Design a protein around this ligand. Structure first.
Ligand SMILES: CCCCCCCCCCCCCCCCCC(=O)OC[C@H](CO[C@@H]1O[C@H](CO[C@H]2O[C@H](CO)[C@H](O)[C@H](O)[C@H]2O)[C@H](O)[C@H](O)[C@H]1O)OC(=O)CCCCCCCCCCCCCCCCC
Ligand SMILES: CCCCCCCCCCCCCCCCCC(=O)OC[C@H](CO[C@@H]1O[C@H](CO[C@H]2O[C@H](CO)[C@H](O)[C@H](O)[C@H]2O)[C@H](O)[C@H](O)[C@H]1O)OC(=O)CCCCCCCCCCCCCCCCC
Ligand SMILES: CCCCCCCCCCCCCCCCCC(=O)OC[C@H](CO[C@@H]1O[C@H](CO[C@H]2O[C@H](CO)[C@H](O)[C@H](O)[C@H]2O)[C@H](O)[C@H](O)[C@H]1O)OC(=O)CCCCCCCCCCCCCCCCC
Ligand code: CLA
Ligand code: CLA
Ligand code: CLA
Ligand code: CLA
Ligand code: CLA
Ligand SMILES: CC1=C(/C=C/C(C)=C/C=C/C(C)=C/C=C/C=C(C)/C=C/C=C(C)/C=C/C2=C(C)CCCC2(C)C)C(C)(C)CCC1
Ligand SMILES: CC1=C(/C=C/C(C)=C/C=C/C(C)=C/C=C/C=C(C)/C=C/C=C(C)/C=C/C2=C(C)CCCC2(C)C)C(C)(C)CCC1
Ligand code: OEX
Ligand SMILES: [Fe+2]
Lengths: 27, 334, 341, 36, 34, 451, 80, 37, 32, 34
């Protein structure tokens, strides 16, 4: 579906920001 | 020490009662030309055939107008977007007939009000001020850009410009809603949100500062004399006004920062009127308001009329009646 | 210390949202009105009062939803749910425009309750009640338009409806039927509102561009703590800026901020006086001297007579749809139409 | 108390908004009030 | 160490409980067939 | 972690891109990741436009702004603006979108991984904003590249296929422009044209000869202005005429882009040569003249005497005179008498429209094109209902011309505001009062009174 | 600074989302079943898409009465 | 339409241009994870 | 018309050259 | 009526499981005020 694209396209923006928060990276 | 460095010592001087500046070497002769030509056209201009169809519209006071119905009538639709100076015409009376005074006024006013904006920058730079009073004046200036120049350019004629007149303005508003549905355009709705909010936050800020003035005077004289000009103490208690307005709604809806407060007072009508001028400038190119004509339909397919269908009948009312003789064809394209 | 003193303590208790004595009148009525707008714009039709779709349930969007006015046959019925028209029936009451009078009367009482709140909080925080005095201009606009104007007309039907496009109907109604642009009391309101929005934008940008440098950062908002007693901006520079740019400047910061109170509040109070006149159809519709001139001269055209031609367009094209109770059956030939449109 | 990072709440409550207004703007084109 | 059922809780919920109910209701309207 | 709170930069989070003014490696990755965003949108929109593409329907009937740009270049279109191969559209979508990951890599690399300043690792790439000859060296490098880009358009026009010509014979066709206007009195005579009606400053460029030769002239003065700014330092009259700051050059670019957005708005609204109506739809002028033509055609087909037929007002209903004397289209479209399209030049003789070329010489492709252009005017709503504001919801049509002019007016006005913001600020910054007025040395208390 | 728990401390506490991951979706579902199960068309009298008009009739069912107006709506509804 | 070897990945393309609108919103997610410091 | 055209043209360019030269005549210098 | 028992059934399942988690936290706040 077009949504499950735009869900995982959209979710995996903040998951970059989620990982660098839960790895204490250079946020 | 020639009379150029003595000339720039006068033009850029803050000691002038009214600051000239380099933008004012354009602003003053354009806006004096746009003011002398305006009041002459407002009193004594013979009737302008605006719609190009040889039906002249009386605009001036001597021809049976009052100040409310008086206008400078926009340039003829036969001219269109054409540059019509005095030397384009064969006589003055031809230039007066085809609405040449309108093109003289708005080309001197917009060029002179653009140079009012940079003159507002220029005094802020001579005074050591921060510079963005010019940026806030770009909100009424884009609005003047839109209804005098941009909406003529998109529509292809200075006859579609806003008439320099009180009731000519109301003609411009009515016809604009008939053709572009400006009320349903969200950029005009953000503009009403800019001027209703602007008037709200004016009366808000005006009343919270006046509510919070420290007692310096007696009730036998005005509270205005508690302020002496140039004083270093703030004349009102900012903590009491925030204590007042914070308890009025809830504490965190409230600018307890005076600078963050006055940015909001600056930015809300300015971004409001920016978007509204962008309303006119985008409905110049016929990107009209929201068209919900016959949107709600039933199971059979019968159109269930809405409030936007009642506006559409009012919009139809003005558009079949605006310029009753100018249209020879069924579609009103421009 | 009896129960009135104890209820005074808890009402004036220092909390997140201040309740107060006005909150007995504000907090239900302001919430029933706004909760009844959202209930009417989501779920209630105008199919029997107006013949319209005006809820999200029917297909309307936020612009086109409204809580529409009652029918003209209701008159100025209060339209209580228990009243003789609804007879208790909630399903019937929403259809008869009862939620319009629910919103226009609870919203009336909440606006009293908010204006009383402005008095009550200013009496407790020790400040002057000028925000209540400045709130008299939204009261007088809500009172003249949503209450006094339909009371002067034949029913609640000609009041504005609580909706975005329905207000837009009401604006275009007043141009066609009242010529409300031409009214001098509306122009004092336009001069007051746009003067307010100008004085909002000017004073906002004047303060923000005459600031004193109190912090070593390039973002100036953190150069202000509120307990300070310094002017955060240079009123002397601000007066010298506007004296040479515009010619005149405020030099009294108290008179400036009274003028900011004065200008939109006098404008919205002047628009009230015009709408009270328009309740009785006392328009500045026509300059009698010009329509005497234009009726025996067929070449005298002004923008005034062009607007009047537009109003005849509005009054005949909108009315068989805008006013369904009248049974205006306007044929396809009585309609005022210019050439080719 | 401060267990959940407030930005994760602020990035999914703000994503609840655009899903719903994106659902509201899609239903402008679908079903009732779509002029179809 | 805080209360739970305050006045603010009633200010929050009397708005936001019918808000979510209405947003579920308006989102069900987007799928009404014609 | 320099310039990343307001403790170290003095810039807040909402002006946190201003923390990168003196961080040349981080400002480079800001610009390359943003360059990657433009090339992403160039790619992803072209794919979105071609995935939702009907080659039966005309391009303006489909909400397409980017497929008309590739089609104007002479790619995958044949006679009369008709798509014969959608693969040159698809490649432009793929070569842009795949290139966006490379600029996305290099934007992310220089921003969040690379050296924060280039002033240590590479003195060639390391720049100071107030180094004036280095600031022309990057200006000279970027001028040659735009001279290379304005010669690639000449290359595509003269060798690699030719551009779409609206004024090709017999309707529009992709034409190799082999004899471009090298004459500078014609190329720079456009610059001295009036912006106003009938003259139309550079928007009146009405053939692909002046377009190609104008891009030989622009494309080689930008090369020769690149070799100029590489080999020179700014002269002394210019050093006192400019603020030499990072925000200053931004403001000069913002003021330049406000010019360009206001001009491109006018190009897409008035010009139908570099924006063919096959792809972009009729102009505002083009549709009003098409409506007057359709009823010039319809009524004379019923035997109206269209030259002598009168309007309500005394004017010609079909055929009146312009205020210069040309026989032009009657009605309100008299404002659009300066409009030139190729579906009515077979009517225009030397007095304007020829009445004897209207009677026995209007071809059915012209009746077809005028009726199409009338019912596809650039009037439309924001929810894309075609027609006037009083039209019903049946026609899903807003022209790309209306979309392109209005978006590039919204953008071009804000870029004038952004110029006024940044030019005021960068001159306040170079003089030292952008953070406020010093209380101990306030200028107005040291400035004399007025009255 | 008045006494209540800060909004940085409520919605971030997990006990909030123990409560509100099962009440915010529940009321969104309750509101869905207001419209989807048809109760919205019955509480407030808003017509269904097949309830604006009778089958052949196309008139607006408009109220012309005040004290004979609740019975008049029912006459229009019995028409459907 | 896309070339016919590409229509499997056609719902991907249908939401591919929303990605640049979300880079702007991701700067606010990234600024909120650092608390807008 | 023939005469007022070049009359306005000289007036315009003299004020415009006054505009352009005075901002070229060290406008960055004229700050407090 | 059946439909009003399906509009209110997730609601009564919401407030119950809401009051099933702050149940001891309600008995600690009413006791502390009293
Ligand atoms: C809330 C206020 C409700 C209201 O106002 O309701 C109005 C009623 C009067 O009812 C109206 O009365 C009118 C007169 O009817 C009379 O006349 C008609 C023909 O003669 C009929 O035959 C009818 O039988 C007869 O009663 C119409 O019939 C309307 O249907 C009906 O709305 O008065 C009342 O309740 C009480 C009104 C008296 C105090 C006035 C307070 C209003 C404030 C000033 C506004 C005045 C209007 C001028 C604006 C400027
Ligand atoms: C100051 C006024 C600027 C202005 O009136 O802005 C309008 C001008 C555009 O001028 C218009 O340009 C047109 C030129 O196109 C001509 O040439 C075209 C070539 O395809 C087509 O043939 C077109 O149909 C034909 O009319 C017409 O001459 C119009 O009458 C003329 O007003 O924008 C410009 O160049 C100047 C840039 C304006 C920026 C926006 C402000
Ligand atoms: C917002 C959410 C939304 O409702 O978005 C909805 C749309 C998708 O909806 C589709 O929108 C389309 C818009 O029509 C376009 O496409 C149609 C054919 O598909 C027609 O050709 C038509 O002419 C053309 O305008 C159609 O109407 C479809 O029916 C509909 O499904 O998403 C979009 O477009 C997203 C577009 C975002 C970028 C727009 C930027 C440029 C717009 C001008 C901005 C400045 C001008 C000032 C404006 C004031
Ligand atoms: C799209 C426009 C854009 C771009 C290119 C940038 C770029 C930048 N910003 Mg800015 N900013 C923007 C908009 C933008 N911003 C907006 C809209 C705001 C308001 C919210 C800000 C507010 C802001 C602040 C307050 C700050 C910046 C800072 C920065 C810089 C460094 C960030 C960093 O190092 O921390 C690390 C960043 C992260 C860990 C976030 C990760 C995000 C990644 C890079 C997303 C991209 C991944 C991409 C899809 C992968 C493609 C390649 C792949 C295919 C191989 C960087 C140059 C900082 C700065 O000044 O540096 C000194 C800084 O303090 N920005
Ligand atoms: C290519 C164009 C361009 C570039 C590179 C910049 C760059 C900048 N702008 Mg400017 N600006 C621009 C166009 C541009 N602007 C336009 C067109 C406008 C008018 C709308 C503005 C209005 C503006 C204001 C009012 C401000 C800036 C500011 C800034 C600085 C920080 C921006 C930030 O972090 O926002 C982050 C993004 C957001 C908060 C969301 C945006 C929506 C940065 C130097 C700030 C500044 O002056 O610092 C020196 C500032 O206060 N800009
Ligand atoms: C016009 C845009 C632009 C500019 C001026 C630069 C400039 C630079 N890059 Mg970058 N870069 C870019 C885009 C750009 N890059 C893109 C699109 C990519 C992906 C291919 C990269 C990937 C990249 C890497 C991996 C490196 C550079 C490096 C460099 C520096 C040295 C160049 C060299 O000699 O090799 C120079 C500052 C080098 C650097 O920063 O040195 C530490 C380096 O290691 N670049
Ligand atoms: C478009 C990109 C671009 C940019 C940003 C610049 C920027 C610059 N140029 Mg360059 N230039 C360019 C393209 C560009 N140039 C091209 C393509 C050519 C070849 C035609 C030149 C040929 C050129 C020469 C010969 C000179 C410059 C100079 C300059 C500097 C002064 C700008 C100025 O005050 O003019 C603004 C406009 C005016 C001052 C004229 C105002 C109107 C007059 C008064 C009318 C009457 C005549 C500035 C750094 C000067 C410099 O400092 O050299 C290094 C200089 O002498 N440029
Ligand atoms: C919201 C962001 C945004 C978006 C989505 C767009 C989108 C667009 N812009 Mg706009 N623009 C924007 C912001 C935006 N702009 C802003 C903020 C400004 C300043 C106001 C502008 C100023 C601007 C101008 C002046 C113009 C556009 C134009 C366009 C359109 C075509 C772009 C193009 O072809 O570039 C072209 C790509 C390049 C220049 C990169 C180099 C490409 C080389 C030179 C091509 C060589 C081709 C050749 C075949 C090679 C041989 C192989 C496109 C719809 C154009 C248009 O048609 O408007 C109607 C146009 O003339 N834009
Ligand atoms: C091409 C392609 C691709 C790529 C993609 C991309 C590049 C993506 C990115 C994406 C992104 C980039 C995303 C993002 C997202 C984001 C989001 C989704 C966000 C949202 C936001 C919000 C919600 C916000 C919130 C907030 C905050 C947080 C703060 C406070 C306030 C506010 C509200 C602002 C892929 C791989 C698929 C594959 C192949 C194809
Ligand atoms: C491509 C093409 C073409 C060509 C074109 C051209 C050739 C162009 C050029 C153009 C040009 C060549 C332009 C120019 C412009 C200029 C400008 C835009 C200027 C600006 C200025 C400024 C910015 C200044 C400022 C100042 C002052 C005022 C004073 C003080 C100092 C200063 C310096 C600051 C043609 C049309 C043929 C055709 C089409 C295509
Ligand atoms: O001129 Mn003034 O208004 Ca713009 O639309 Mn067409 O033209 Mn006329 O009709 Mn509608
Ligand atoms: Fe103030």
């Amino acid at each position: 579906a077009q949504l499950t694209m735009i869900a995982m396209i959209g979710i995996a923006g903040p998951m970059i920001i989620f990982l660098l928060a839960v790895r204490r990276g250079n946020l | 020490a020639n009379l150029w460095e003595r000339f720039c010592n006068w033009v850029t001087s803050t000691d002038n009662r009214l600051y000239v500046g380099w933008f004012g070497v354009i602003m003053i002769p354009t806006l004096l030309a746009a003011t002398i030509c305006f009041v002459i056209a407002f009193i004594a201009a013979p009737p302008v055939d605006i719609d190009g169809i040889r039906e002249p519209v009386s605009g001036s006071l001597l021809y049976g107008n009052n100040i409310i119905t008086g206008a400078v009538v926009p340039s003829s639709n036969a001219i269109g977007l054409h540059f019509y100076p005095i030397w384009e015409a064969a006589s003055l009376d031809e230039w007066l007939y085809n609405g040449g005074p309108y093109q003289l006024i708005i080309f001197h006013f917009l060029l002179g009000a653009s140079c009012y904006m940079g003159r507002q920058w220029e005094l802020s730079y001579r005074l050591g001020m921060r510079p963005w009073i010019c940026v806030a004046y770009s909100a009424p200036l884009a609005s003047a850009f839109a209804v005098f120049l941009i909406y003529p350019i998109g529509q292809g004629s200075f006859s579609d410009g806003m008439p320099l007149g009180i009731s000519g303005t109301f003609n411009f508003m009515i016809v604009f809603q008939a053709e572009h549905n400006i009320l349903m355009h969200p950029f005009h709705q953000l503009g009403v949100a800019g001027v209703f909010g602007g008037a709200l936050f004016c009366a808000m800020h005006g009343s919270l500062v006046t509510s919070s003035l420290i007692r310096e005077t007696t009730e036998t004289e005005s509270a205005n004399y508690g302020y002496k000009f140039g004083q270093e103490e703030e004349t009102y208690n900012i903590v009491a006004a925030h204590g007042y307005f914070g308890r009025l709604i809830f504490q965190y809806a409230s600018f307890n920062n005076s600078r963050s407060l006055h940015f909001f007072l600056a930015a809300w009508p300015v971004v409001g009127v920016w978007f509204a001028a962008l309303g006119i400038s985008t409905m110049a190119f016929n990107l009209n308001g929201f068209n919900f004509n016959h949107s709600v339909i039933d199971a059979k397919g019968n159109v269930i009329n809405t409030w936007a269908d009642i506006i559409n009948r009012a919009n139809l009312g003005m558009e079949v009646m605006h310029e009753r003789n100018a249209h020879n064809f069924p579609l009103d394209l421009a | 210390r009896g129960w009135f003193d104890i209820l005074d303590d808890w009402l004036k208790r220092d909390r997140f949202v201040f309740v107060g004595w006005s909150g007995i009148l504000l907090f239900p009525c302001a919430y029933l009105a706004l909760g009844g707008w959202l209930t009417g714009t989501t779920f209630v039709t105008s199919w029997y009062t107006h013949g319209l779709a005006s809820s999200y349930l029917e297909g309307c969007n936020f612009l086109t939803v409204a809580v529409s006015t009652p029918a003209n046959s209701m008159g100025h019925s209060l339209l209580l749910l228990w009243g003789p028209e609804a007879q208790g029936d909630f399903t019937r009451w929403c259809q008869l425009g009862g939620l319009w009078t629910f919103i226009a009367l609870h919203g009336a009482f909440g606006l009293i309750g908010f204006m009383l709140r402005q008095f009550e909080i200013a009496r407790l925080v020790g400040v002057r009640p000028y925000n209540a005095i400045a709130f008299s201009a939204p009261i007088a606009v809500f009172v003249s338009v949503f209450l006094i104007y339909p009371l002067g007309q034949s029913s609640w039907f000609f009041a504005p409806s609580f909706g975005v496009a329905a207000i837009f109907r009401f604006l275009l109604f007043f141009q066609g039927f009242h010529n409300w642009t031409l009214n001098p009391f509306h122009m004092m309101g336009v001069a007051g509102v746009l003067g307010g929005a100008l004085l909002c934008a000017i004073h906002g940008a004047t303060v923000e561009n005459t600031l004193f440098q109190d912090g070593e950062g390039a973002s100036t908002f953190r150069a202000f703590n509120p307990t300070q007693a310094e002017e955060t901006y240079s009123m002397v520079t601000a007066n010298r800026f506007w004296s040479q740019i515009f010619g005149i400047a405020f030099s009294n910061k108290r008179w400036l901020h009274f003028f900011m109170l004065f200008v939109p509040v006098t404008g919205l109070w002047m628009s009230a006086i015009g709408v009270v006149g328009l309740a009785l159809n006392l328009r500045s519709y026509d300059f009698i001297s010009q329509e005497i001139r234009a009726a025996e001269d067929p070449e005298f055209e002004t923008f005034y007579t062009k607007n009047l031609l537009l109003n005849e367009g509005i009054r005949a094209w909108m009315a068989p749809q805008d006013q369904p109770h009248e049974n205006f059956v306007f044929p396809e030939e009585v309609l005022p139409r210019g050439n080719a449109l | 108390g401060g267990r959940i990072p407030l930005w994760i709440v602020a990035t999914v409550a703000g994503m609840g908004v655009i899903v719903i207004v994106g659902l509201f703007f899609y239903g402008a084109y679908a079903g009732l009030g779509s002029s179809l | 160490s805080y209360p739970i059922f305050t006045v603010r809780w009633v200010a929050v919920h009397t708005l936001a409980v019918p808000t979510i109910f209405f947003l579920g209701a308006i989102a069900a309207m987007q799928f009404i067939q014609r | 972690a320099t310039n990343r709170d307001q403790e170290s930069s003095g810039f807040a989070w909402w002006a946190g891109n201003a923390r990168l003014i003196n961080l040349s490696g981080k400002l480079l990755g800001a610009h390359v990741a943003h360059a990657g965003l433009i090339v992403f949108w160039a790619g992803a929109m072209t794919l979105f436009e071609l995935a939702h593409f009907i080659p039966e329907k005309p391009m303006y009937e489909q909400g397409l702004i980017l497929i008309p740009h590739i089609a104007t270049l002479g790619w995958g279109v044949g006679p009369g603006g008709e798509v014969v191969d959608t693969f040159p559209f698809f490649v432009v979508g793929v070569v842009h979108l795949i290139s966006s990951a490379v600029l996305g890599f290099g934007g992310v690399y220089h921003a969040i991984r690379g050296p924060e300043t280039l002033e240590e690792y590479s003195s060639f790439f390391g720049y100071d904003w107030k180094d004036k000859n280095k600031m022309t060296t990057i200006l000279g490098f970027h001028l040659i590249v735009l001279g290379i880009g304005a010669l690639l358009l000449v290359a595509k026009a003269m060798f690699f296929g030719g551009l779409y010509d609206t004024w090709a014979p017999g309707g529009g066709d992709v034409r190799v422009i082999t004899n471009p206007t090298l004459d500078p009195r014609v190329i720079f005579g456009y610059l001295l044209k009036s912006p106003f009606g009938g003259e139309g400053w550079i928007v009146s460029v009405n053939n692909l000869e002046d377009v190609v030769g104008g891009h030989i002239w622009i494309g080689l003065i930008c090369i020769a202005g690149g070799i100029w700014h590489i080999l020179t330092t700014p002269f002394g009259w210019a050093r006192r005429a400019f603020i030499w700051s990072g925000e200053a050059y931004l403001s000069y670019s913002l003021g330049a882009l406000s010019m360009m957005g206001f001009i491109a708005t006018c190009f897409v609204w008035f010009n139908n040569t570099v924006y063919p109506s096959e792809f972009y739809g009729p102009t505002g002028p083009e549709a009003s003249q098409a409506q007057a033509m359709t009823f010039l055609i319809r009524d004379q087909k019923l035997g109206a005497n269209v030259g002598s037929a009168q309007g309500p007002t005394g004017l010609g209903k079909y055929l009146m005179r312009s205020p210069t004397g040309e026989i032009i289209f009657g009605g309100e479209t008299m404002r659009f008498w300066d409009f030139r399209g190729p579906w009515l030049e077979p009517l225009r003789g030397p007095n304007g429209l020829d009445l004897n070329k209207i009677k026995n010489d209007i071809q059915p492709w012209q009746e077809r094109r005028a009726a199409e252009y009338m019912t596809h005017a650039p009037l439309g709503s924001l929810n894309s209902v075609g027609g006037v504001a009083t039209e019903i919801n049946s026609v899903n049509f807003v022209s790309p011309r209306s979309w392109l002019a209005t978006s590039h007016f919204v953008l071009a006005f804000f870029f004038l505001v952004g110029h006024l913001w940044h030019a005021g600020r960068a001159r306040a910054a170079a003089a030292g009062f952008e953070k406020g007025i010093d209380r101990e040395s306030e200028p107005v208390l040291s400035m004399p009174s007025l009255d | 600074t008045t006494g209540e728990r800060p909004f940085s401390d409520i919605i971030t506490s997990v006990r909030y989302w123990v409560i509100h991951s099962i009440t915010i979706p529940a009321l969104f579902i309750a509101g869905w079943l207001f419209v989807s199960t048809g109760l919205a068309y019955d509480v407030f009298g808003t017509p269904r898409p097949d309830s604006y008009y009778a089958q052949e009739q196309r008139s607006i069912p408009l109220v012309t009465d005040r004290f004979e107006a609740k019975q008049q709506v029912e006459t229009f509804l019995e028409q459907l | 339409k896309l070339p016919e070897a590409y229509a499997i990945f056609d719902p991907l393309v249908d939401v591919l241009p929303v990605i640049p609108v979300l880079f702007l919103a991701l700067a606010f997610v990234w600024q909120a994870a650092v608390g807008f410091r | 018309m023939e005469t007022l055209k070049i009359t306005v043209y000289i007036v315009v360019t003299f004020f415009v050259l006054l505009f352009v030269f005075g901002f070229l005549s060290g406008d960055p210098a004229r700050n407090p | 009526d059946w439909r009003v028992l399906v509009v209110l059934l997730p609601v009564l399942l919401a407030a119950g499981w809401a009051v099933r988690n702050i149940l001891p936290y309600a008995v600690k706040q009413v006791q502390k005020l009293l």
